Design a protein around this nucleic acid. Structure first.
Ligand SMILES: [Mg+2]
Ligand SMILES: [Mg+2]
Ligand SMILES: [Mg+2]
Ligand SMILES: [Mg+2]
Ligand SMILES: [Mg+2]
Ligand SMILES: [Mg+2]
Ligand SMILES: [Mg+2]
Ligand SMILES: [Mg+2]
Ligand SMILES: [Mg+2]
Ligand SMILES: [Mg+2]
Ligand SMILES: [Mg+2]
Ligand SMILES: [Mg+2]
Ligand SMILES: [Mg+2]
Ligand SMILES: [Mg+2]
Ligand SMILES: [Mg+2]
Ligand SMILES: [Mg+2]
Ligand SMILES: [Mg+2]
Ligand SMILES: [Mg+2]
Ligand SMILES: [Mg+2]
Ligand SMILES: [Mg+2]
Ligand SMILES: [Mg+2]
Ligand SMILES: [Mg+2]
Ligand SMILES: [Mg+2]
Ligand SMILES: [Mg+2]
Ligand SMILES: [Mg+2]
Ligand SMILES: [Mg+2]
Ligand SMILES: [Mg+2]
Ligand SMILES: [Zn+2]
Lengths: 203, 158, 50, 122, 86, 118
RNA sequence: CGCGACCUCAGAUCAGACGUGGCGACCCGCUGAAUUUAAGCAUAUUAGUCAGCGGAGGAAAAGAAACUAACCAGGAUUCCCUCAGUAACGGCGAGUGAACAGGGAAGAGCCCAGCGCCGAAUCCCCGCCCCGCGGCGGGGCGCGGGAAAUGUGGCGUACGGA
């Protein structure tokens, strides 16, 4: 099939052809708006890996995220306290810019529901992400039993709770010795389960 | 300010622990709730055992415990292939199946195959339609005598 | 203010009707616990907020 | 007479409007009698007139809206007042047939491997 | 002269009766409500104002829709059915 | 086609009117501001009777949501009498007092004796 | 220059739907101190805590190993006892501090992209007939309109599959 050729063609990014394509696409997407609709995917293979199909009610938004770390929103210095917390410039935001892209697309569209998202281009000042959005209300999704879990009200705003992949990569969850701080439900559930007194009846 | 003689101690009460105090007064009500849910499952599956499907003779890892024998997650695929039971038939006839397990030892392999051979003989399979029985079904004298087994089915004794 | 608005005039109109006392038959009931109107606002004592 | 709601349903809509207008004239006359200073019979009669107006308007609204939903019953699209007003999260659910829609592979699994009925011996 | 003589110059009003929360906390210059934040789409509530929470909750006012939601819930939200007539 | 202006405005596209398949509400809401409901009662004040006897008017108490044209058509439809003018005020009680100046062909005292007030 | 497709982008009080906001005890994602302690205090501690922000549900989250172990090997997730105030972190000071395994409550497994085979074998909307219509569904008739080869559906997913 053609998809494996397209897959390793998108893998080999350092070549002349793909550097030319990333430069032209990143230029065009920088001239476009910060949030708009792509009527077709730029990476159809990567969209198919993430779960996009070619049917009605599957929408793709191309949005941009301004690139860089997160500085502390305070006046000039003036973090009133001990010298640990005077760091303002070199702070980093806990979630990734792809998850920032997902939550911005999901906040712009409360009706549409985020499936996942992928990278298409980056500038020094911006990154560019295609976010896959799904109707939970169109009949082609609603009558399909494979995707009707999207139509359930449990998956409302996955992009804010971190249920998509770019949010799950920021939660630090997993199995094994490297993920002890999120055993249980999450990191908060781990901390709450560890910091309780089990004061029994008969003790 | 410590006195004359005593143990050094580190009380972990420097956080705000009084907000997160799990009181255990739900305990006898939860015992009643587990009891009612277990009796509800036992009344739901009427000929089937109240415990569940059978669980393998399992050696323990981690050299402190390897003399002891547990009841495991499920039977191995090589165990099912030697015993001659398909892995999708086994889940329907009440057999725990997991694909993650391996078979390094031959003795535990033969023991779980023998336990499958014993469970296939002890199993009383009811027909799908009562009016038209099939080839692989139990007899009408066993249809009346079949009943539940209280506790774990074939309890593994060390 | 002689230059009133309709909302402020309606708000004053409700308070002018609330300012009236209780009738004499209301304390002849069985389970009465009201001797008088305790919400009598006078125009010098309480200045209605605002 | 005591205007009951049973005989108002069988009558024609124009007779309901004429009786409504007669009750409105009767209410206006009792309000004029109250302001001029009237009898306590009229002061108790005005409540009966108000409840009779409420009954007549209720019967008119029944004969209107049940006929409207009888008209829009056979059609697929019906107005929002005639659509069933329950809670929003219950209206935004899946359909009863869509909760029963399974895939072909899942139906093949349910055909080939049903949960068998079995028992064990002691 | 910061007290009694300065209190006499108080005649122009800054706040007025709001039209979403009802309290007299709608500032005219900023055109916003100091009680609930009226030009904002959301209700202004805070967790440091724990007593000011319970002054304005669901248990405070009428619940003219929520009580019949509860009444329809306790019989399973039946719609259109009528009881057996005489 | 030549570009006359250096600007490029948005071209006038075609748009359609509302042709809905079904109406939003099932029935139109009835006029709850009826002629009977818009006129509550006439006043029996000594000053109101002096106004009726002197200036050939009628003093009514009206719901606050009304218009002068609504009061005029309401009096004309209910009591079958023509109206010269309507003067409205809103009382500190809340209701709208209406001085309905009648035409001089009909008598205010005669129509007051007809409706009952004295 | 005119006509006809495709691609991008508009305008609609176009036909049919959805989101906005509230509660917020429990749950998820961020952001996030200072009181206090260290008999001072600056690392630490209070503390991923208070406050702030967004999002749901009747539970949420997690969840069927890019796992634990090194044993005669166990075998999704969640919760309890124990591991254990232990290994370990810490002006190694004050203090902080798990995980494996064992005993239990419960126990349920799976689906795609790819790789490939099947005349797109697939999906949505509108017209007519029959049933039912207060969770707008099932069948038939339409040289009706679109979506889709820049890939819909069936077999099939690491336990092998065709
Ligand atoms: Mg510090
Ligand atoms: Mg952080
Ligand atoms: Mg999940
Ligand atoms: Mg990583
Ligand atoms: Mg001492
Ligand atoms: Mg001592
Ligand atoms: Mg058990
Ligand atoms: Mg004064
Ligand atoms: Mg399939
Ligand atoms: Mg001012
Ligand atoms: Mg809010
Ligand atoms: Mg429209
Ligand atoms: Mg909300
Ligand atoms: Mg100190
Ligand atoms: Mg001190
Ligand atoms: Mg000090
Ligand atoms: Mg900390
Ligand atoms: Mg907080
Ligand atoms: Mg809810
Ligand atoms: Mg869940
Ligand atoms: Mg484990
Ligand atoms: Mg110990
Ligand atoms: Mg030291
Ligand atoms: Mg700590
Ligand atoms: Mg364990
Ligand atoms: Mg395919
Ligand atoms: Mg797997
Ligand atoms: Zn307000």
């Amino acid at each position: 099939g053609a998809y494996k050729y397209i897959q390793e063609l998108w893998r080999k990014k350092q070549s002349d052809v793909m550097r030319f394509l990333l430069r032209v696409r990143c230029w065009q997407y920088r001239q476009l708006s910060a949030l708009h609709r792509a009527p077709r995917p730029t990476r159809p293979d990567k969209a198919r890996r993430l779960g996009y199909k070619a049917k009605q009610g599957y929408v793709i938004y191309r949005i941009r995220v301004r690139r860089g770390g997160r500085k502390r929103p305070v006046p000039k210095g003036a973090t009133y306290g001990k010298p640990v917390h005077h760091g303002v410039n070199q702070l980093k935001f806990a979630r990734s810019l792809q998850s920032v892209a997902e939550e911005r697309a999901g906040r712009h569209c409360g009706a549409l529901r985020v499936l996942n998202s992928y990278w298409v281009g980056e500038d020094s000042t911006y990154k560019f992400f295609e976010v896959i959005l799904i109707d939970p209300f169109h009949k082609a999704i609603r009558r399909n039993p494979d995707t009707q879990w999207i139509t359930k009200p449990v998956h409302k705003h996955r992009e804010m709770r971190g249920l998509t992949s770019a949010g799950r990569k920021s939660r630090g969850l997993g199995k094994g010795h490297k993920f002890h701080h999120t055993i249980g439900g999450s990191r908060r559930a781990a901390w709450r389960r560890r910091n309780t007194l089990q004061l029994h009846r008969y003790r | 300010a410590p006195s004359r003689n005593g143990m050094i101690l580190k009380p972990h009460f420097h956080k705000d622990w009084q907000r997160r105090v799990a009181t255990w007064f739900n305990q006898p009500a939860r015992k009643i709730r587990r009891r009612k849910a277990r009796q509800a499952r036992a009344r739901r599956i009427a000929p089937r055992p109240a415990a569940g499907p059978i669980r393998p003779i399992v050696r323990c890892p981690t050299v402190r415990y390897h003399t002891k024998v547990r009841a495991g997650r499920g039977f191995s695929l090589e165990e099912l292939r030697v015993a001659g039971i398909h892995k999708k038939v086994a889940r329907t006839i009440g057999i725990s199946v997991d694909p993650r397990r391996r078979n390094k030892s031959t003795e535990s392999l033969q023991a779980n195959v023998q336990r499958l051979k014993e469970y296939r003989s002890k199993l009383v399979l009811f027909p799908r339609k009562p009016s038209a029985p099939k080839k692989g079904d139990s007899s009408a004298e066993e249809l009346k005598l079949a009943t539940q087994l209280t506790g774990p089915v074939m309890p593994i004794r060390n | 203010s002689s230059h009133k608005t309709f909302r402020i005039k309606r708000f004053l109109a409700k308070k002018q009707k609330q300012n009236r006392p209780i009738p004499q038959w209301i304390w002849m009931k069985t389970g009465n616990k009201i001797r008088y109107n305790s919400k009598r606002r006078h125009w010098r004592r309480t200045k209605l907020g605002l | 007479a005591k205007i009951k709601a049973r005989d108002l349903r069988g009558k024609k809509k124009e007779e309901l409007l004429k009786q409504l207008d007669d009750l409105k004239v009767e209410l206006s006359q009792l309000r004029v009698a109250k302001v001029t200073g009237g009898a306590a019979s009229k002061l108790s009669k005005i409540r009966v007139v108000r409840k009779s107006i409420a009954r007549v308007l209720t019967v008119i609204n029944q004969t209107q809206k049940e006929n409207l939903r009888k008209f829009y019953k056979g059609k697929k699209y019906k107005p929002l007042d005639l659509r069933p007003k329950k809670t929003r999260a219950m209206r935004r659910r899946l359909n009863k047939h869509e909760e029963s829609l399974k895939t072909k592979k899942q139906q093949r699994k349910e055909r080939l491997y049903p949960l068998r009925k079995y028992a064990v011996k002691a | 002269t910061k007290g009694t003589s300065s209190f006499g110059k108080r005649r122009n009003k800054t706040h007025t009766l709001c039209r979403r929360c009802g309290s007299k906390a709608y500032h005219l210059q900023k055109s916003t409500c100091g009680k609930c934040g009226y030009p904002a789409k959301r209700k202004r509530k805070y967790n440091w104002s724990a007593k000011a929470k319970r002054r304005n909750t669901t248990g405070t006012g009428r619940m003219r829709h929520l009580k019949i939601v509860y009444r329809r819930f306790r019989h399973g939200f039946r719609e259109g059915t009528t009881p057996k007539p005489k | 086609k030549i570009r006359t202006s250096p600007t490029f405005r948005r071209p006038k596209t075609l748009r359609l009117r509302r042709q809905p398949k079904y109406p939003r509400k099932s029935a139109p809401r009835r006029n709850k501001l009826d002629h009977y409901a818009i006129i509550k009662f006439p006043l029996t004040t000594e000053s109101a009777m002096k106004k009726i006897e002197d200036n050939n008017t009628l003093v009514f108490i009206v719901d606050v949501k009304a218009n002068k044209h609504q009061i005029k058509q309401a009096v004309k439809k209910l009591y079958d009498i023509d109206v010269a003018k309507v003067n409205t005020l809103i009382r500190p009680d809340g209701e709208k007092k209406a001085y309905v100046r009648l035409a001089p062909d009909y008598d205010a005292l005669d129509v007051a004796n007809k409706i009952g007030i004295i």
